[PDB]
Design a protein around this ligand. Structure first.
Ligand SMILES: Nc1ccn([C@@H]2O[C@H](COP(=O)(O)OP(=O)(O)O)[C@@H](O)[C@H]2O)c(=O)n1
Ligand SMILES: Nc1ccn([C@@H]2O[C@H](COP(=O)(O)OP(=O)(O)O)[C@@H](O)[C@H]2O)c(=O)n1
Ligand SMILES: [Ca+2]
Ligand SMILES: [Ca+2]
Ligand SMILES: [Ca+2]
Ligand SMILES: [Ca+2]
Lengths: 341, 333
């Protein structure tokens, strides 16, 4: 057992995006493999190692790892103390005194973690920072199946986080958002079938809306510690259905004009699925996140749906199929070659 | 460090399916996290734990785990001894005496492992058992296809052929089958179906040879799956393209059949990605895994109805995908 001692503060009682700051630090530390102990005066229990947090803080880091005794720091400011089990041999019943003693007996290195020390004034700042930590990127500490693409990170996340902020105060669950996001893709697909510029235009808009909202399910999940294995599975599986159904609807309509589009449609659908499959198969076989180091063709899902959007507003959904089919299939082949090395 | 002491025997020099029995026991124990030491007379080195194998044996178990002192047994027969580090406090330079001493000081529980004690006559028996140990397979794969592939892998074992080469070669066969479909004649459709089934069988050999010769790799596992997605797509696309000339409606059935094939694979691999365990339904599941899909294509092709295969794959495949979505709601998260 590992113990995390967190000094009580009146500000921990304030709610930030659905959860009190008290449960947030509690769950983050629990995730990190610590049994949590809130205290006013500290009585020491036996454990392998000790984490001590004296000042009120919001931890933003997601995959916190503490190996070896060190001082945890946020931008030069001490966030907490991580001592070894031998701290028991120094503790004298006074926390202030004991920390001074233990620190003098050692030379602890500083260790940077993403966190914000909390004040009565900077809670608006903490909200924005907490939201920004919800994105699938390396800076946050998350270890997903894949990281957000450029379109996702700089465009879609900007909108979805604003939506998730409003959803945080509700009882809406990630799975519900996932299903709703999937349903939106069907609305977009149905609009394509009506075969008119207006409905084609509306479809593209809704497909992009779907692309954005499909980020909210993951955001709320990470934001409220409601992540789940099934949720992760469902989120992905339905995205394959969406990609397939969207391309089918566009292909079916275009086939009325020229049957050749069946082939381009077939190739576009396959590409979309294989970009997903190559990445998820990598995770399955390597048991680590898929992430290209250098050159990669920007044809990840965030790009594919933006392309469908952009092409749809100019009434050329066929061009999106061509682009996805070409860029997508070459990217799939590229991954095969790149992984050989 | 954990040390595995294996007493030398003349039989370890014999070759079984491409590798000497000496190399096989060495590699198997290394996989299990042991440093191996072959010996005539035993001199003891310091280590966390000790594994002692006195009689010549071929280990068939794949995921051997040794936690806590035990005697390793195969059908009542002692295969080896697994002693704690405290064996150092008893060893007196004589192996027989030291083992006798340590065994009398303890009360070792027995622990069953899959293995066969080796002799000069039962090597044919060891070959069959080793081959059988190479095979989440569907019923068709396990009871039909494996029967043929193991016989092929047996011949491949004596060669320098790698798993990746078999995977790519298998992928090539699927293209030949697809090309034959495009020629639009019963004969070529019949030949196509046969090659698709041959492809299905040989697609088991890459995994067999990999496990048989300890040549498993992450990229190999990745490639094995990815190219099978390519094969499934190209086969269905090829059948659909020809059939579309008669009735364009088959484009829709083809799209649904291709999608189904890909999603049966994706749902399974995505499960592994999210749950980090093998996908395996406890009870009922619609038999439309790859071994079934390709047999259906084969069976329908010999009677010149490849269109029926698309319908069947499209129907059973999509319902199975949907079934998995609903079934997984149960015990997960
Ligand atoms: N219903 C859901 C949806 C996502 N998640 C989690 O969030 C991750 C996906 O985040 P995301 O939705 O922002 O990713 P994208 O689909 O936008 O690319 C999944 O892998 C899950 O870990 C969940 O737990 N339950
Ligand atoms: N070129 C290859 C092919 C398979 N393998 C391994 O063998 C497994 C596949 O076994 P298999 O080919 O007998 O059965 P299938 O999964 O292909 O139906 C892969 O998951 C790999 O662990 C490999 O390492 N390299
Ligand atoms: Ca999502
Ligand atoms: Ca989704
Ligand atoms: Ca294979
Ligand atoms: Ca394969």
């Amino acid at each position: 057992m590992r113990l995390a001692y967190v000094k009580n503060h009146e500000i921990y009682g304030e709610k930030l995006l659905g959860l009190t700051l008290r449960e947030r630090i509690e769950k983050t530390l629990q995730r990190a493999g610590f049994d949590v102990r809130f205290f006013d005066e500290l009585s020491l229990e036996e454990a392998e190692d000790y984490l001590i947090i004296l000042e009120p803080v919001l931890i933003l880091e997601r995959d916190l790892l503490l190996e070896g005794r060190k001082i945890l720091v946020s931008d030069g400011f001490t966030v907490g103390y991580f001592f070894g089990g031998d701290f028991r041999t120094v503790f004298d019943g006074n926390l202030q005194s004991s920390i001074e003693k233990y620190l003098s007996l050692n030379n602890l290195e500083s260790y940077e973690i993403w966190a914000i020390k909390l004040s009565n004034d900077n809670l608006k700042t903490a909200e924005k920072l907490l939201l920004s930590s919800l994105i699938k990127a390396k800076r946050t500490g998350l270890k997903p199946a894949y990281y957000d693409g450029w379109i996702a990170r700089e465009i879609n996340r900007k909108v979805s986080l604003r939506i998730s902020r409003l959803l945080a105060d509700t009882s809406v669950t990630p799975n519900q958002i996932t299903v709703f996001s999937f349903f939106l893709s069907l609305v977009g697909s149905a609009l394509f079938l009506l075969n008119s510029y207006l409905t084609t235009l509306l479809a593209g808009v809704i497909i992009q809306l779907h692309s954005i909202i499909d980020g909210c399910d993951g955001e709320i999940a990470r934001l409220k510690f409601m992540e789940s294995k099934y949720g992760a599975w469902l989120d992905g599986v339905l995205d394959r259905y969406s990609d397939f159904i969207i391309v089918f609807s566009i292909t079916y309509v275009l086939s009325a004009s020229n049957p050749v589009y069946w082939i381009i449609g077939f190739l576009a659908a396959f590409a979309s699925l294989m970009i997903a499959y190559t990445g998820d198969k990598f995770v399955a076989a390597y048991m680590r996140t898929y992430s290209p180091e250098g050159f990669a063709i920007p044809i990840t899902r965030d790009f594919r749906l933006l392309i469908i959007f952009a092409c749809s507003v100019v009434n050329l959904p066929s061009l999106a199929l061509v682009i996805i089919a070409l860029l997508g299939n070459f990217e799939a082949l590229r991954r095969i070659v790149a992984l050989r090395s």
